[PDB]
Design a protein around this ligand. Structure first.
Ligand SMILES: Nc1nc2c(c(=O)[nH]1)N(C=O)[C@@H](CNc1ccc(C(=O)N[C@@H](CCC(=O)O)C(=O)O)cc1)CN2
Ligand SMILES: Nc1nc2c(c(=O)[nH]1)N(C=O)[C@@H](CNc1ccc(C(=O)N[C@@H](CCC(=O)O)C(=O)O)cc1)CN2
Ligand SMILES: [Cl-]
Ligand SMILES: [Cl-]
Ligand SMILES: [Cl-]
Lengths: 288, 289
């Protein structure tokens, strides 16, 4: 087979050549296309992109915090991972009109929705225990008890909650599906920062599928990535033109280091990325 | 060449017949299934109503107008001559899900409810929901009118809080609009596709919805992109589909809107005309209740 990384590089090239120029909320400007699809195998490989060093600590800390149910950027920041920080700052918060919120309180984003869909948000500090729908645990429970079920969904798109989010979910909705003894996942990504977010988001969902496969006794299958609004910010064009000239090296493997029973017990130290040989880091700026 | 138009649907069928996995399902029918497919249907001077069989267009049109009104009552649809929801609202079905105290035809907070009242507290199918919840459809329209650059133009029917009250959770789960070159496109995330019966309706339906929104926003329809999660043929569809896969698609019909409409709720059935529709004969297929 060809390297799966070529799909992503394919997507980049496609946007650079035929994407429309639009204005955007962030002021940066973008090139954008609508409606793309890639399929990354998870069978004895893991799609951490190799044409640039991806911040793997970032992906892994990020997801654990999602699982944790946290909406507090500083709880992520404590770990070495400054990715959510700008969306959670005094400045940004004030520019959305959220003058009462504390520094780092992103609103009812991913963690809250994955774990407590439907609950009344208050602040990142509240104890939301027992409240809302625990979509994640229900996914796991469905995979174990009725793997043939056609409703195995986790949705972060909460239209009621939209007005309180520092930012509405880019990765809006996933579906898992079991065939033979393999667990697959399809992500519907309504909005894809192709330069910065998407490398993270791909690894993020591949890693989630690995975790759920581990605790359900399934083997991981495919991660299918459906994009809606896929954009390159203009300050990413030159950076990605550098990236486009690199040859993918073989994807690494993800190793899980102990039998873990419940999604909540996973710790950063339970994972090891083996045989990851990326090209150098390419600094790209985050559009705020 | 890679397939285009109806050929995508036909090839989707062939792939499930030759490739899908045999599973038992909630209906007891059995299915063949496959996970994660995609098709792109042009809406430019063509309307994707399948020609390899006669699709019940009035069904499609009457089902979408019912969605838009925000009805959750099978009988309001049934009374228009369109029976496709009756089985999912019958006494027996409702009871089998434990809804004994609920009136026949009360589907719960399904599609129409979520589009125009997302997050409101569902009472019964009879309640006035005038001005409660999030009106997603109206929000779609207005953001298209005023900020086409917005990468958050989304109508989502998937409501985890409301699932336990639904006759059936949404098969067409979420949709997103996109605007380029004064053209309106729409991607649909269909978590569950009944490939022989519902999927022909769904395509026609999203394409319909896109024509109406294009029409009220001063845009021209572009593309309908169809993303399938779980895609499945019911076993007792297999022989009927074998007739269908024998036939050559004919060119798609055109859809004409008959008058200048300003508001979404203003559309009536009389406003649409399908022109040059030329299907091979209806192929009947039993529904999986
Ligand atoms: N513009 C934008 N904002 C967003 C997202 C996004 O994808 N794009 N997100 C949705 O995903 C969240 C943030 N995700 C992010 C993922 C990676 C990086 C980033 O700066 N990547 C660098 C830095 C790595 C490091 O910190 O050492 C890199 O990989 O080069 C930033 C945000 C919320 N806000
Ligand atoms: N099994 C099943 N249940 C479902 C759906 C579905 O697609 N399949 N739906 C999600 O979409 C909803 C109803 N949609 C339907 C659309 C068409 C037909 C059907 O029987 N089609 C016949 C109609 C013929 C006629 O009425 O004249 C046909 O097209 O031959 C049934 C349900 C609710 N539950
Ligand atoms: Cl609650
Ligand atoms: Cl480096
Ligand atoms: Cl012919």
């Amino acid at each position: 087979p060809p390297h799966g990384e070529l799909q992503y590089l394919g997507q980049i090239q496609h946007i650079l050549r035929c994407g429309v120029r639009k204005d955007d909320r962030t002021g940066t400007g973008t090139l954008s296309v609508f409606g793309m699809r890639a399929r990354y195998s998870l069978r004895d490989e893991f799609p951490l992109l190799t044409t640039k060093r991806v911040f793997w600590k970032g992906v892994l800390e990020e997801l654990l915090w999602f699982i944790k149910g946290s909406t507090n950027a500083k709880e992520l920041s404590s770990k070495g991972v400054k990715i959510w920080d700008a969306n959670g700052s005094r400045d940004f918060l004030d520019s959305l009109g959220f003058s009462t919120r504390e520094e780092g309180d992103l609103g009812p984003v991913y963690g809250f929705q994955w774990r407590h869909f439907g609950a009344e948000y208050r602040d990142m500090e509240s104890d939301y225990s027992g409240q809302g729908v625990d979509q994640l645990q229900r996914v796991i429970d469905t995979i174990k008890t009725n793997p043939d079920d056609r409703r195995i969904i986790m949705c972060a798109w909460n239209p009621r909650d939209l007005p309180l989010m520092a930012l509405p979910p880019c990765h809006a909705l996933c579906q898992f599906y079991v065939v033979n003894s393999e667990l697959s996942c399809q992500l519907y990504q309504r909005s894809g920062d192709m330069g910065l977010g998407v490398p993270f988001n791909i690894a993020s969902y591949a890693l989630l599928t690995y975790m759920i496969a581990h605790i359900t006794g399934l083997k991981p299958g495919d991660f299918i990535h459906t994009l809606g609004d896929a954009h390159i910010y203009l300050n990413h064009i030159e950076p990605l033109k550098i990236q486009l000239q690199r040859e993918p090296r073989p994807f690494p493997k993800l190793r899980i280091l102990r039998k873990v029973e419940k999604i909540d017990d996973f710790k950063a130290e339970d994972f090891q990325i083996e045989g990851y040989n990326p090209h150098p880091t390419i600094k790209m700026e985050m559009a705020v």
